[PDB]
Amino acid sequence: MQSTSNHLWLLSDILTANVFRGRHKKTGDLFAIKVFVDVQMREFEVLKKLNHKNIVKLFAIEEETTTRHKVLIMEFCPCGSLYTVLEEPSNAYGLPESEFLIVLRDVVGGMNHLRENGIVHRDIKPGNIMRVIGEDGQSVYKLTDFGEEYLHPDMYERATVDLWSIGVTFYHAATGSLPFRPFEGPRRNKEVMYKIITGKPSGAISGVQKAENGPIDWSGDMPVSCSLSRGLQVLLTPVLANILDQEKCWGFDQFFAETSDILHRMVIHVFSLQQMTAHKIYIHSYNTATIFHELVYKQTKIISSNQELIYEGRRLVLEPGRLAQHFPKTTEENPIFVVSREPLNTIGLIYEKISLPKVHPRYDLDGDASMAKAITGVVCYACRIASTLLLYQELMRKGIRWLIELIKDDYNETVHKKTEVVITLDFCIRNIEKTVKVEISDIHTKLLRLSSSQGTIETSLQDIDSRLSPGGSLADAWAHQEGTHPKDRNVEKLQVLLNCMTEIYYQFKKDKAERRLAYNEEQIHKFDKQKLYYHATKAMTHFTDECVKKYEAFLNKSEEWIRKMLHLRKQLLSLTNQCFDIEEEVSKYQEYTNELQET
Amino acid sequence: MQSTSNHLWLLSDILTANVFRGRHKKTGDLFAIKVFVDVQMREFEVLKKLNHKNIVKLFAIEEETTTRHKVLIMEFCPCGSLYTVLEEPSNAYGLPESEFLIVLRDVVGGMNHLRENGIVHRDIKPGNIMRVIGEDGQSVYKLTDFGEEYLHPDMYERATVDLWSIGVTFYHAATGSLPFRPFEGPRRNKEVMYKIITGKPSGAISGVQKAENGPIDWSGDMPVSCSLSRGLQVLLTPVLANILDQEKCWGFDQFFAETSDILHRMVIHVFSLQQMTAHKIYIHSYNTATIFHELVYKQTKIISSNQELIYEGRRLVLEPGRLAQHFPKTTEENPIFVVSREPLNTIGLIYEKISLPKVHPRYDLDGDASMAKAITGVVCYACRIASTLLLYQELMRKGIRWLIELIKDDYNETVHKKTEVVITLDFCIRNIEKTVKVEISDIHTKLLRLSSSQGTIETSLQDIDSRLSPGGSLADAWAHQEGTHPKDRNVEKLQVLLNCMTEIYYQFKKDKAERRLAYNEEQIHKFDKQKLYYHATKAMTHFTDECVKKYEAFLNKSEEWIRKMLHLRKQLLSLTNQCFDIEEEVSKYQEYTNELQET
Numbered sequence A, B: 001m002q003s004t005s006n007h008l009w010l011l012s013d014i015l016t017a018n019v020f021r022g023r024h025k026k027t028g029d030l031f032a033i034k035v036f037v038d039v040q041m042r043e044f045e046v047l048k049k050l051n052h053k054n055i056v057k058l059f060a061i062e063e064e065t066t067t068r069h070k071v072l073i074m075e076f077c078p079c080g081s082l083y084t085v086l087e088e089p090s091n092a093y094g095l096p097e098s099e100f101l102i103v104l105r106d107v108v109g110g111m112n113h114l115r116e117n118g119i120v121h122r123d124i125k126p127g128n129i130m131r132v133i134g135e136d137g138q139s140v141y142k143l144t145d146f147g148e149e150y151l152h153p154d155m156y157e158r159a160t161v162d163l164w165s166i167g168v169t170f171y172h173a174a175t176g177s178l179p180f181r182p183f184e185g186p187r188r189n190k191e192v193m194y195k196i197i198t199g200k201p202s203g204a205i206s207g208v209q210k211a212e213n214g215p216i217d218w219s220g221d222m223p224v225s226c227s228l229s230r231g232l233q234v235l236l237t238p239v240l241a242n243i244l245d246q247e248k249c250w251g252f253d254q255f256f257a258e259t260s261d262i263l264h265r266m267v268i269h270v271f272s273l274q275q276m277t278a279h280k281i282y283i284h285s286y287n288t289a290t291i292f293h294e295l296v297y298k299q300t301k302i303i304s305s306n307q308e309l310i311y312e313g314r315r316l317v318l319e320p321g322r323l324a325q326h327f328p329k330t331t332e333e334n335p336i337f338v339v340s341r342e343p344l345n346t347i348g349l350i351y352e353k354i355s356l357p358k359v360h361p362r363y364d365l366d367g368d369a370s371m372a373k374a375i376t377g378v379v380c381y382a383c384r385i386a387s388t389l390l391l392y393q394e395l396m397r398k399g400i401r402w403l404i405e406l407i408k409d410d411y412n413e414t415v416h417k418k419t420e421v422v423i424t425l426d427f428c429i430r431n432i433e434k435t436v437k438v439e440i441s442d443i444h445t446k447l448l449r450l451s452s453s454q455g456t457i458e459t460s461l462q463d464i465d466s467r468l469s470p471g472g473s474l475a476d477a478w479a480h481q482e483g484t485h486p487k488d489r490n491v492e493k494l495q496v497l498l499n500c501m502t503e504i505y506y507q508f509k510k511d512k513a514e515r516r517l518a519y520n521e522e523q524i525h526k527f528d529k530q531k532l533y534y535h536a537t538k539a540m541t542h543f544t545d546e547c548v549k550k551y552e553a554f555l556n557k558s559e560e561w562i563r564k565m566l567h568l569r570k571q572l573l574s575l576t577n578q579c580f581d582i583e584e585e586v587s588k589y590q591e592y593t594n595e596l597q598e599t
Ligand SMILES: CC(C)c1ccc2oc3nc(N)c(C(=O)O)cc3c(=O)c2c1
Pocket: A015, A019, A032, A056, A074, A075, A076, A077, A078, A079, A080, A081, A084, A130, A144, A145
């Protein structure tokens, strides 16, 4: 092992220079050791001064003992880098929405700080971007090491040029895949990649070659497999397209403003009950409900006037100018439900039907490890989708229960109003005949039409109540019989299989670094290869045969049940508007009974 | 390494016979290898036949190659045993309620199966009780190895005798500590332990010697540090006391019935909003709401008639004979709230004030590892308490919001009723004078008292509405200003520190097994010892100075706010009952206006 006056480090604990994990001799504290005249000591001094949350801290520069080479003692990051993170199987299709926002925040704050100090980081990339655990348990990302797949079109032939690798990095972080992918690999087909980058039509954000020498699939949208909400997708997509000829690139100042406008927005969770879709609304703290409805329309196509809100079992009435920071707090588990009195197509969750790749029987430490990553990533995606499908079903079941409770309030508000006017109708109908005992035939004939008109409402209200009752045709019971429930524990069953798959993946990663295995370790490696396929086949069978099939039956049943719900609200409204119309005609003949008197 | 025809195993992977972790030569599958004429082959054959969920499966018995000794190839349990689990720091004060119920279920099913087959397991204990992960992610516990601290009073001098070690095991699992503890250790003071076990007065479930040669603390209750709900505590406590002179022991058949009666009960989560206490109600599927109210009274002292229920923002009206299996589904996050119209003392969460033990500077691999377990266990407890305190605050804030919404419904129901009778009062007051123009002075004077009596209600209703409005004295705003919130992330801050503490604990466990460390590894061990105390002191400071202090301010503010709430419901009721009384006196003079007529 080498050493310096203050530090020492084993060469085995290595993290083209080398980086080792070592300790301070006097404290034992972990530090990053960078192992490789005054032109460097100057730029080192300015870097030694840099103290920022998003910059890995450089503590000291010491001389190793055996060589006189300059070493840097740097802040150690136990978790590793964004590359490490993006190599994990649960992020194979993008970071979790919450995690993606932390990467954006910390990268943005570090860059601006760099610009503010004149440094240029020619090649930002996931391998340059280190992760540390903040004292509050949230990831904090920190830039370090300033001074192909990420290189600019001008650089690939061999500032905005920095924005390019930033763009690729964010797409990779958002989707788990590179945005520009020749068939095979970009390094493998360096020539195809340059054509893709220069010939890209403006606005496009990706180009994938699916067959060898095949065409390029352009897209202005994120892939379906991206986990970011549509709300977030709608804001991020234009930024990437407009920052990936640097003449028409956005530029930093515009980039900093547009990204700050995203980071300053809060998220409101909305579930479209008739469409069976969950939504995240990215809205500024100071925006009004008026603005909120427009953002919801963009994702739902429900005009403001048709948006009917339900929250914690009761109607939510938003005032147009009420600011979003004063809205009730929501989560994915507790969203604001939106419903509409106008028919809407039931969409549900739209996801990609992805099958397992074939498992190549040929023993290959590199291929199996490469395959293990891909097949494990698919199961992670399947597990995430299973959870969202279950959540969609759980939210559906809760929202319907509340809506039934809302209708009963409406039913009780109008039903009281009727009996409330009956007490006057049945009273004033006789008080007329009271005077008679002390043309009136024309008043009684018109009045007897109101009681007869009021009887058709009574029997119709009793028919709606009958339908809202436990045996009614709009009953709830079906929601507990179809689809899947938490007590079914389908998600835990998939995660258990994933954990078995994840252990083998990490072992294949270890098996790769050691170039050859002994006979025994070799056999064990081949045994677990068949178990991988066996676990994946069992899981996919359970996922497709049980989760998806039952989800579509619950969804198909909802679509007809939804249709019924719309019919009831329409019938109730008609009965409700007639009660106001009847109420005012009786409140009009109430006085024309009494004439002026002589006195 | 040794081997047999079908299996082989390294001696390093060892799990007084030895148990190693090995593989099947042809498949690679993990199995437990037990390494030590026809008297044994017979009992082995009956054991080879045993196929049960709660019995570790014995697959085959083979002969090792170097020795002719008989070995048993047994089902491998990757997680280890209940001892292992109970050694983890987050279970230092008992298993999670959900986990405790799984241990009970699997132990009970295996025992009965054993009895049903005639086997006797003379010494059940956490080390005998192995854990495996079920295919649904839930622990499954399985008995194995049949054929001091757990020994019966008759056995300690040197079937029911089996129930004793079962009793000690359940207490240990429930609380994290042994029920019978001489000062120092039971093994250390074998003599004190026997007096404790024979001289224990009936009904007592624990005996702890807190000082050397000191007295015995008896208890019929679980310690405060137990995590099991009071609902569960109320059922478990009598079982342990009555199964720990075997003349008056419960016996198996009674034990199996009483335990089945517990396992067959469902759990309903209840939060007493006026007491600020959460509750789990252990109730049978077929019990009625009538029975439910009695169980709630036992934990709350709220008589049935005074129990007012709120669920998902609306009143919950339970019919007395409605079975519990038809109740709405509840969780700790979404409980049924109970409120009362009668004043109740605000209790809140009652927990033990536990300080850190002192850290002994004396280097000792055994002492530090022993200390590391204890001090890490305390922080786990503090983290669990922090979470419950936060949950209590979050549930309080939600329930109050709903109650305010409930009162507004009540306020609107009576306020409509009034205006509904005004339309008749203001109508019939003039219709009287209508006839006059065509003793009556006595009718007008009594009637003008009703409008005057109705004006005092109107101004009083406007005063309650004023108080229910945003500026009202019963405002909600305070609930968002006091205590702690999820966005404060206090729990994550504690878990992060715990994870740092937990890594050192596991390292101390490793450092212990290796009897001596080299100079370098020794220094690193001493460095992390000071960090342990440093992390614990920082955490406790944050816990006491921030979490507890702010919790008591939110609680103290609630107690006065609660007092106000009770005053409003009492004033509203008075205004509400007068509206019915007024309504019927006006509905009585409405007809006495018109007399019989000649005809
Ligand atoms: C084995 C791989 C996943 C890994 C694990 C932990 C690591 O911890 C680091 N800390 C640092 N400060 C720096 C740096 O400042 O460059 C780099 C690394 C790693 O490369 C690194 C790499």
